[PDB]
RNA sequence: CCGGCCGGGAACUCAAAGGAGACUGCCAGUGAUAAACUGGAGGAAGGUGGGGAUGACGUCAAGUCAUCAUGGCCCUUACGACCAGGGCUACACACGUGCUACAAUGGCGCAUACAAAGAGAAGCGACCUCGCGAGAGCAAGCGGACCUCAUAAAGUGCGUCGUAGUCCGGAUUGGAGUCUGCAACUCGACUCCAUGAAGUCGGAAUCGCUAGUAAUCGUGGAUCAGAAUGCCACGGUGAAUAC
């Protein structure tokens, strides 16, 4: 019924408000298939190092980005009030709707 | 020149990272400059407010941004009342809502920012490059550290002819990636020029 | 050659086309517009083209049409 | 087994033997088999008189040839006399498309010397 | 970098949207099957740097035209130097 | 290989024979990392080969193999001044290494058609020594012997 | 039950079924041939059959992606191996010795700013 | 509807978190009963398992005042600033780095099998339809393990070419076109049709690489309206040799 997409670089995290949310739902209602991995779209920045000449320095930086699923089937007008108004982790992405 | 940057080494483990938002492509590029506008903006401002390091955060349509300080006080004047006129000004720039949180630095002779600023705002009031390093390292081992260095670059004094200088007194495993190192930069605006400061501060390890 | 869908012409060399169609030719007639296409209606005239340095004299002819402005005004002086 | 071209060619398959004239390549030729109702891989063995000059007809279709080269000179005289930059080029020897010359302009602009 | 030519930058931005996007859209289907009367083309007088594609793209922080990324909206040499001071989320020293 | 003498890595004994050795010969014939149009030509150099000499095949090749081994190399040896073009005498283990390579290195360069036969046409005439790796080894022995003088 | 082992190899991941039936064999839903019998490493697929007799003793149908002709071939190799599991140990040590069992981590090497392509190093002159 | 497609299935492949695991520790010889090496066991992995990142005090007044910053210096109705057009793309040459070849381990037609890794709203754009084609019109999905970019190529199968400046090789030029963009003359990329140079494997001399490497085959990306033989990534097939 409501599937929560959860992205942030934060990995160490992400799954410590995927937890919260899981938590916050298997407490109040339930259901919930699990929290789901979901493939890590990670980019790829390479830099050249020296502010002039010497394109053989280079610096490789990343940019890892997270997913979680959740999933819950059932949803309790209270399942569905924990939530909301208990919710924070100021930097994961959290897509409520599909 | 061959050494890596001794924080941005470490984000990975063991270090922050000063900004920690999530952003998309489309807004992560006005987010940075959002940034690099509101750091610029307030250092300005609590410039003699000895500011080590400012943090942001915009949590969904706002922005939090704490600002590391070494003197509380002084950057939140007359009970909150110039943190106010800097919520007003930050919120004012982000385009969006602005909270602000303020929080405190302890034994700052141990904070790598605050210590090479000072040198830094030494060497403009035309002191011994010398005696000013000699008195960083020292108060530093004073309380803790089980390291610490600092280098400052040329015109040192003001020879025609430019130097650096180092002051290794612990230890220093810039090697070691669990090794809690604070490092940092500051550059001091002199007339006869601009000379580089760099410490190194060893804290811990795991 | 590009284009397809309507050959290019700057307005203000246009309108010098035909304050010289109507009217009949002056001296040369200065552009700056290297773009322009030559079209049927500037024949017997004398567009001075820009090359970089000076504009040179062109006098259009029966073919010299599908060719932009240009293509007769050398801006590399080399020997 | 001469056809259109002053040229004579055969003694392999036909789609290979009819680009030997000026003229055509590859496409015109596939095109030229195809219309002309033959199969490409077929030797002028087996090709008798009356499959020849039907195609003889289906080159006689284009301007092949003498005049293909005729034509291709007339144009590059074109450009000659206008005095344009591509007309320019041709007479001075360098390459026209617009290719680099501070170095490998050699085909168009002929082995080194001095 | 040379005020004057980030200036250029933001004028060339203003217009680029004044008109283009907007105004020079009368242009968009203007120019497809819907034939005819040239008037339609002709029109291009509209300052010149109204186009978008007359923007270069500059290091937000510094103006280098060269070496930019838009992800960051920085030049690589800003890019680390920030990179290094945390200031860029999520962004590590990578390796594989 | 300065200080960490080392080993072999033991390829696959051959998918159609059962056989270090030829599994070495395709390898060595193989270009451009192509194992599979490798192989399809000494099997069907092989398949000329063959009935062409009816002694079989596996042993047909030994004997032509058994021709272009040479047993004996002129070393380098740069001392002061001196080259010293030292001859000596050759391990087994490459002796057939060499003598397959100069094989394959003979039939790329034959004026053949197509290099199965070139090298068909190379293993037959090396069989009855007279071939361009035969002719090899009647010069890496003519060139040791000749440097003889020293040993 | 469905006895099986793994197996995979070089970005390849094939997993192998086995059952006492025959010794007809179907990967991806195909003919030993109809995938690469007939190409180069027909006879590798095979290969886990030799001092572990079958020839219409026990049936294989697996499944495998990822990787190439010889990759794959290598990862139903394993498997077979690692699914000879279920009949004991006391096979799975002249797998040992055959080397069926290893897992080939031979992976390829990243291309490293400065090179050509990991270790092609581009051409230097002095002048 | 023989499409994992609908129920279902939680097994397996994978997915991203967390753990375990390898330590010369175990046997054995070698070695001063040391360090270590060597070989064997087991094991997915042996002897820093494979790769990355990480570059000490320092050397070259080595590079960067043009990324930025800045001491001094100098111009200020000009060394600043606006617009146009042109130039950085020139061309007797010389050198460096690369791409494409000289060919049957190949060319070519046809059929056909197997990857990885990334990108995407002012975006990726299916489908359908039009066009020999580049493309064009229309139009669905997808902020994306869903949708699109996207139909890997080597390979394998038949077939043809028969050692030839060739059905090898594609330069150069003619003509006609497509898309981007106010604008493709200078100077964009691509496409159709014709054109078919040099080149038959390269003097002296000289570079790379020790294994999933070299060699070879395709794929993507950053910059970017457009403009990659470069650059940064990605798997496929897959060697030779070290006294
Ligand atoms: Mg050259
Ligand atoms: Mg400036
Ligand atoms: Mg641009
Ligand atoms: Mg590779
Ligand atoms: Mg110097
Ligand atoms: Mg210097
Ligand atoms: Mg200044
Ligand atoms: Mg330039
Ligand atoms: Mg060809
Ligand atoms: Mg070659
Ligand atoms: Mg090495």
């Known amino acids: ?44 920045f390479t830099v050249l190092i020296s502010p002039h000449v010497n394109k053989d320095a280079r610096d490789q930086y990343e940019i890892r980005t997270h997913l979680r699923l959740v999933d819950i089937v059932e949803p309790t007008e209270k399942t569905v009030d924990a939530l909301m108004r208990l919710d924070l982790a100021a930097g994961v992405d959290v897509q409520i709707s599909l | 020149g061959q050494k890596v940057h001794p924080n941005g080494i470490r984000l990975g483990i063991v270090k922050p ?103 830094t705002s030494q060497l403009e009031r035309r002191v011994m490059f010398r005696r000013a390093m000699k008195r960083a390292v020292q108060n530093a081992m004073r309380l803790g550290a089980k390291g610490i260095k600092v280098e400052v670059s040329g015109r040192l004094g003001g020879a025609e002819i430019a130097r650096t200088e180092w002051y290794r007194e612990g230890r220093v495993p810039l090697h070691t990636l669990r090794a809690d190192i604070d490092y940092n930069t500051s550059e001091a605006h002199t007339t006869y020029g601009v000379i580089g400061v760099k410490v190194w501060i060893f804290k811990g390890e795991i | ?59 259009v002819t029966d073919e010299m049409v599908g060719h932009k402005l240009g293509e007769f005004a050398p801006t590399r002086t080399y020997r | 087994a001469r056809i259109a071209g002053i040229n004579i060619p055969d003694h392999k398959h036909a789609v290979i033997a009819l680009t030997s004239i000026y003229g055509v390549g590859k496409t015109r030729s596939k095109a030229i088999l195809a219309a002309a109702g033959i199969a490409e891989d077929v030797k002028i063995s087996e ?68 | 970098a040379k005020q004057s030519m980030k200036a250029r930058e933001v004028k060339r931005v203003a217009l680029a949207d004044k008109y283009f996007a907007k105004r020079a859209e009368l242009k968009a289907i203007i120019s497809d099957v819907n034939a005819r009367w040239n008037a339609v083309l002709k029109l291009q007088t509209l300052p010149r740097d109204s186009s978008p594609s007359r923007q270069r793209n500059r290091c937000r922080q510094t103006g280098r035209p060269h070496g930019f990324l838009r992800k960051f909206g920085l ?3 800003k890019v680390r130097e920030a990179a290094m001071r945390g200031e860029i989320p999520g962004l590590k020293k990578a390796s594989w | 290989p300065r200080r960490r003498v080392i080993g072999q890595r033991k390829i696959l004994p051959d998918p159609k024979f059962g056989s270090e050795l030829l599994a070495k010969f395709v390898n060595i014939l193989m270009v451009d990392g192509k ?29 032509a193999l058994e021709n272009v081994r040479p047993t004996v190399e002129v070393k380098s040896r740069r001392v002061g001044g001196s080259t010293y073009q030292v001859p000596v005498e050759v391990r087994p283990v490459r002796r057939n290494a060499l003598a397959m390579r100069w094989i394959v290195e003979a039939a790329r360069k034959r004026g053949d058609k197509s290099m199965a036969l070139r090298l068909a046409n190379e293993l037959s005439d090396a069989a009855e020594n007279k071939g361009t790796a035969v002719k090899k080894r009647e010069d890496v022995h003519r060139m040791a012997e000749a440097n003889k003088a020293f040993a | 039950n469905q006895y099986y082992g793994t197996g995979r190899r070089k970005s390849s991941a094939a997993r192998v079924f086995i059952k006492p039936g025959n010794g007809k064999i179907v990967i991806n839903q195909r003919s030993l041939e109809q995938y690469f019998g007939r190409e180069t490493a027909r006879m590798v697929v ?48 002249e797998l040992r010795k055959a080397g069926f069992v290893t897992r080939d981590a031979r992976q390829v090497e990243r291309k490293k700013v400065g090179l050509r392509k990991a270790r092609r190093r581009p051409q230097f002159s002095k002048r």
């Not at chain 2, 590391?68 to 982000?94: F, M, N, Q």
């Not at chain 7, 495998?64 to 190799?77: E, H, L, N």
């Open chain 4, 47 to 114: 090709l008798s008189e009356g499959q020849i000059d039907t195609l003889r007809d289906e080159v006689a279709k284009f301007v092949v040839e003498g005049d293909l080269r005729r034509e291709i000179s007339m144009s590059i005289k074109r450009l000659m006399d206008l005095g344009c930059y591509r007309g320019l080029r041709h007479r001075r020897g360098l390459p026209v498309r617009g290719q680099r010359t501070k170095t490998n302009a050699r085909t168009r602009k002929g082995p080194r010397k001095p």
């Open chain 3, 1 to 59: 050659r590009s284009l397809k869908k309507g050959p290019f012409i700057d307005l203000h060399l246009l309108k010098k086309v035909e304050k010289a169609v109507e009217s009949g030719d002056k001296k040369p007639l200065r552009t700056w517009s290297r773009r322009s296409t030559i079209f049927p209606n500037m024949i017997g005239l004398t567009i001075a083209v820009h090359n970089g340095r000076q504009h040179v004299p062109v006098f």
């Open chain 5, 75 to 77: 030049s690589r040499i």
């Open chain 1, 1 to 44: 019924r409501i599937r929560i997409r959860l992205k942030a670089f934060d990995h160490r995290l992400i799954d410590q408000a995927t937890a919260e949310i899981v938590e916050t739902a298997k407490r109040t209602g339930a259901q919930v298939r699990g929290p789901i991995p979901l493939p890590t779209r990670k980019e790829r």
């Open chain 2, 17 to 119: 990272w000063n900004s920690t938002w999530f952003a998309n492509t489309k807004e992560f590029a006005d987010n940075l400059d959002s940034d690099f506008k509101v750091r610029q903006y307030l250092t300005k401002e609590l410039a003699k407010a000895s500011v080590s390091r400012i943090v942001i955060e915009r949590p969904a349509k706002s922005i939090r941004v704490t600002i590391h300080t070494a003197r509380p006080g002084i950057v939140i004047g007359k009970k909150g009342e110039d943190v106010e006129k800097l919520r007003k000004v930050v919120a004012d720039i982000a385009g969006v809502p602005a909270q602000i949180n303020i929080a405190e630095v302890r034994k700052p002779e141990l904070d790598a920012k605050l210590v090479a600023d000072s040198i």
């Open chain 6, 35 to 63: 194992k599979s149009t490798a192989e399809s030509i000494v099997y069907s150099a092989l398949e000329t080969l063959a009935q062409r000499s009816g002694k079989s095949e596996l042993e047909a090749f030994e004997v």
């Open chain 7, 46 to 93: 095979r290969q886990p059959l030799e001092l572990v007799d079958m020839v219409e003793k026990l049936d294989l149908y697996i499944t495998v992606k990822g990787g190439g002709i010889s990759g794959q071939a290598g990862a139903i190799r394993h498997g077979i191996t690692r699914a000879l599991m279920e009949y004991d140990e006391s096979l799975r040590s």
